[PDB]
């Protein structure tokens, strides 16, 4: 006896792709803050 978590093991990876995936798009949005914030400084400083 045991418990056939065979496909269930690799299944975790299925969601994992989603995990890596969503991030790029948030972080792509985060990037605006790093530009706009330096632009916000730029127009006062430069």
């Amino acid at each position: 006896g045991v418990i056939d978590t065979s496909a269930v093991e690799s299944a975790i990876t299925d969601g994992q792709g989603d995990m890596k995936a969503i991030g790029g798009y948030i972080v792509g949005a985060l990037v605006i803050l790093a530009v706009a914030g330096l632009i916000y400084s730029m127009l006062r400083k430069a």
Copy 2:
């Protein structure tokens, strides 16, 4: 199994446009400070 963050991935870009967008208008306002400040100097210096 996995988690279909398919549209959710590109969704991040939807907000991202907003991120790039808002900045131009703040920074367009920032620009006044760079003019007015040099004008503030101009009338004393020149």
Copy 3:
């Protein structure tokens, strides 16, 4: 002898679709938190 969990095996997938399904809608809502939160900062920072 045995126990005919023939249809009941695939039956578990019936519910599964709903498990996948509800997530998208919740996660669609969660997304606002990621926009608003970043605009919450946007308006102080940018």
Copy 4:
């Protein structure tokens, strides 16, 4: 068998609209910080 999350799928969009909706009002307020803050500087700098 399965689980009829038919209306409950679209139901998540019901809340979503409110997620989009509240943000605009908060962000509308945040905007004052960007004006006042820049006028806060305006009156010392300009």
Copy 5:
């Protein structure tokens, strides 16, 4: 289903007026810095 942020949408404008409102008073004070500062120079320069 959805979430009735009907009054809560316009509610954000309630606070907004106060965001616009406080600024004028602060900026009214900041103005002295622009007078005094220039009179601070006035009395040495003129």
Copy 6:
């Protein structure tokens, strides 16, 4: 998904007008210093 910073974008311009506006009046005051200072010199030099 995205974040409707549609009116919020043009909104930045609303304050911007204020930015350009206030300057003219400070700089109109600055001008006195350029007259009075040359008058301050005038009565000794000429």
Copy 7:
């Protein structure tokens, strides 16, 4: 809903009076520089 910055609006004028007020005293002092400086020259020139 809104935010009752009723008294806080006029409150900013409370501080304002002091902004106007301090200036006169400083500028009253600055005046000596304009007398002394001109007497500093007076005694060499006249």
Copy 8:
């Protein structure tokens, strides 16, 4: 959105009057130096 620097714009003129005003009285004092200095010369030269 914007920032109501409506009265604040004309406000700059309020101080401006002061700017033009103070000058006449310093320059009225400067004038002594132009008389006394030519008198200082007069009594030696003429």
Copy 9:
């Protein structure tokens, strides 16, 4: 609300007296330049 610059207003006069005060002593010294300078000429001219 306001800001009690009550004593601080008259306080500026405290310093003022010293502004008036120092001048007399400097101008008292400047006077020698007007004597000596004229005796500097006296001894060649007279």
Copy 10:
């Protein structure tokens, strides 16, 4: 808004009197040079 240089304007006149005043006494001293110098000539010429 503006800057109450009301008394400060007439204040300039206060010093001005001093400006006109000091001159008479220097110029009263200058006069000796015009007498003594013509006396210096007188005793050789006449």
Copy 11:
């Protein structure tokens, strides 16, 4: 405001006495030239 050139005005007279004073003694010396020169002529002419 003004500039208390009160004693400073009469002060000019203090030096003035000196101005009138020194002259008598130079001119008393000048007188020799008017005697000696007429004596210089006297011994040739008379």
Copy 12:
């Protein structure tokens, strides 16, 4: 409040004595010009 220019007032007289003092020595030298100059003429005229 005020500014204790108590000793600094009389301090200006400290320097004053030196202003009076140096003059006598210079004027003592200038005197030779009045002798020599008149002897310069003496030897041609007398």
Copy 13:
């Protein structure tokens, strides 16, 4: 406070001696003009 023109007072006498000194030599030369001039006449008159 004051200004120690102690040695500088007597210092002016240092130069004075030279003022007295140079005169004698010039006047010694001027003397020839009084001899020669009178011999210039001597040889025509006597």
Copy 14:
């Protein structure tokens, strides 16, 4: 990613013109002191 300061680059030159422009006017005024000063001297010297 980057930050599109494309038009904002050339925008700097928009103000620049102003910088070069204002100068000529002031400079044109300054020129009078160069004339008046020489005339101020002309009338005494010439």
Copy 15:
């Protein structure tokens, strides 16, 4: 595992160009004060 900031590394340089770019424009404007200031002085001095 790690975090693929591969393009985001070089992405930083995308903005960098902007940083170096904007400067030249402002700097080009600043140059006028260096000219106008010297002309401002030229007309008085030269």
Copy 16:
């Protein structure tokens, strides 16, 4: 028993590289403000 975080230990360093990597790019951009700021000052000062 234990928990085989063998590769997950070194896995941490996988991301670490990213952490050190991203910085250089931003830092490289930051450098422009250090140049532009000094140029911003250069043109006024030098």
Copy 17:
């Protein structure tokens, strides 16, 4: 009677090592933000 948790006691430490182990890696990554953040500031400040 009792319950032989003899090896299971020490078994807890098997995992413990993991707990202490993982930390160093993450901590090592965290360190970059402490560097990058100061560099992020360095380039503006220094």
Copy 18:
């Protein structure tokens, strides 16, 4: 963007007129020393 120093350019000439204007008056006064000085000499010479 730029800075509308359109009227402020020509504004410089507004003051300029003053600069040229004042001179003639002083110059007209200076002329007396050129007359009086020659008369001062006339009466001795002629």
Copy 19:
């Protein structure tokens, strides 16, 4: 903008009268040397 040297222009003539006025008096005194000098000669010559 400009600088209202309207009355200050004609003000120059206020002093001018003085310039022409003083001369006549001195000139009137100078005349005695023109008489006395000729009488000084008259008595020897005539």
Copy 20:
């Protein structure tokens, strides 16, 4: 046979109303922290 959960089905909605009802009240209270928090910040920032 079956089990007549006819009214008990709709009975569930009886409570449901309560579920939606209570929320608005708490939510209405929560709103104060969103105001007070921003005021909490307003007074320091603005």
Copy 21:
């Protein structure tokens, strides 16, 4: 069936008053930092 959250609905507002109430007090205290901070700056700047 249902759940009589009749008074408990309005009960939420009972606390709500508290939420709005407390804020004013803290906000009233926060205001001092807005005064003290400007005074903190006033004394150095003005």
Copy 22:
């Protein structure tokens, strides 16, 4: 139901007094830099 923040409301003012109190002391110290700074300048200028 509600939450008896009755005394806690007024309690906020307890601290408030402190907020207004501390300021005067610091402000009183700040004043020295306004004196010392002008004296710092006085001794060079006057």
Copy 23:
């Protein structure tokens, strides 16, 4: 409740003494430039 800034209020004056104290020393040093500068001029002028 409140915050016992009782001794911390008067504590501010502890430092204040320092603020007034340091000034006199620097001011005492500054005085030398006022002497040395006039001596610096004395030796050329007198």
Copy 24:
């Protein structure tokens, strides 16, 4: 609390000595121009 500027008070006098010290040397050098200038004139005049 306060700030122990005890030795730093008297420390100011440490430098002060320097201030008075340097002057004598420069002043001693300046004296040559007062001699050389008179000699510069002596040789032409005497």
Copy 25:
């Protein structure tokens, strides 16, 4: 603390020597005009 102007004190005398030195040379040249001028007269008079 103080400022070690120890060698810089005596350093002043280093230049002083120069001041006294240069004079003799010019003075030596000036002497020719005192000779040539008398010869210039000698040849007409003698």
Copy 26:
């Protein structure tokens, strides 16, 4: 420190030669008036 007027000292003598040199030429010309004048008289007298 000092000022190396080493060659500039002797440099004065470079010009000096010129001073003595020019004189002889003029003096040589002057001599003719001493001859011509006596011849001018010779022809009438002798």
Copy 27:
């Protein structure tokens, strides 16, 4: 039949008092954080 939860109903209130009670004392402790935190800010800000 039924179940006499008569005293048991009111019994719930017995504990309830405890519920309201404990809170005041925690929240009385919470208050320190609101004082100390503003004091923590006070000593840096004010």
Copy 28:
């Protein structure tokens, strides 16, 4: 029934003392920053 939170209520105060207590010592440390920071300014400003 109820829950005897009798001593537990007053117990909250036990910790509360600690809450008030710790603060004084942090804030006593904060005070250094307010001294040292004004000292940091003092040595540059005064």
Copy 29:
């Protein structure tokens, strides 16, 4: 109950010493700027 912050209270003082300590050494360094800056002025002014 309470929380024994007994040693923790006095502990704050432990760091406090450090707070007072570090300052003296920075401020000892600051002092150079006050010497060197007055030396920087000294060599131009004196």
Copy 30:
């Protein structure tokens, strides 16, 4: 507890040496201006 700023205290002195050090070399350069400027005067005056 405390904070061992033991070496950090003396560390401040390490930089301090640098502070005293750099000055001598600038001020050594300043000295040229005091020589050259007096040389600039020397060649016109002497």
Copy 31:
């Protein structure tokens, strides 16, 4: 700790050479004025 201004100290000397250097060439030009001016006198006097 300290700040290695080691080469920076000697660096000051590098510029210093320039300081001494430029002077010789200006002063070499100054010399013309001392020749030409005595030549300007020479042709009238000799």
Copy 32:
């Protein structure tokens, strides 16, 4: 009947001591954050 929780009552205090005990050690660590954080600022501010 009842239930003898005699020792189990006091037993709860056994654990309590440990609840009090662990806190001190954690809070001892937290203290570094209050030192370091303030030194983190110290080194920028002081």
Copy 33:
């Protein structure tokens, strides 16, 4: 009964040492900001 936090009490000190330890290194870095910042000013000011 109780809970043997015997070693765990002293265990908290284990971490504490590291809390003290890390600070020194960060603060060692912060020190550069205090040197550089002051040299950043040094090179403009000195």
Copy 34:
């Protein structure tokens, strides 16, 4: 137990070197300001 910040202690020195390092380069640039500024004056003064 404790926390092995063994390498992390010395690690802080790793960054330190860079803190020392960057300064030299900036300060090397600052040096031009001290040369140019003094040559900026050199060309007007010398």
Copy 35:
């Protein structure tokens, strides 16, 4: 660990060259002031 400011060290020299470079051009302009100024005098003096 450390921080690789390897290229950034030499990078500071990159800017340095420009610091040296700009100076020559400004100083080249300053030179005219030294010519013109001396010709400004030339035409009156020579």
Copy 36:
């Protein structure tokens, strides 16, 4: 890295030409003073 002052180097020559240029015109005017002055003498002397 470095700073491209390539065109800005030669740019300084752009202004230079104007420095050379203005001089000729002023000096052309100065020339009249040398003619008139000599004709001013011409008409008395010749």
Copy 37:
């Protein structure tokens, strides 16, 4: 870059004409001295 002294070059000639112009009138007056002086002699000699 350069500086457009195009019109300003020829502008100097504008003033020049006036330099030539005034001379003739003065010299026209000087002429009387040459007539009168010679008639002054005429009437004694002829």
Copy 38:
């Protein structure tokens, strides 16, 4: 470091030539006065 005044040194000579040059032509004009003046004498004397 230093300041490359290499060509700038020899540059001074460039103007110097001009200095020597202009003189010859003025002095060539001066010569007329020495001829015409002796001619003015010649026609009366010879």
Copy 39:
């Protein structure tokens, strides 16, 4: 660098012609005195 006194050199000759020119006409007038004076003698003598 230098100063293009190229045309300015030959320019001196332009006036020079005038110098030689005017003389002939005065001297032509002088001649009358030599005729008339000998005629004045002629009618008595011959």
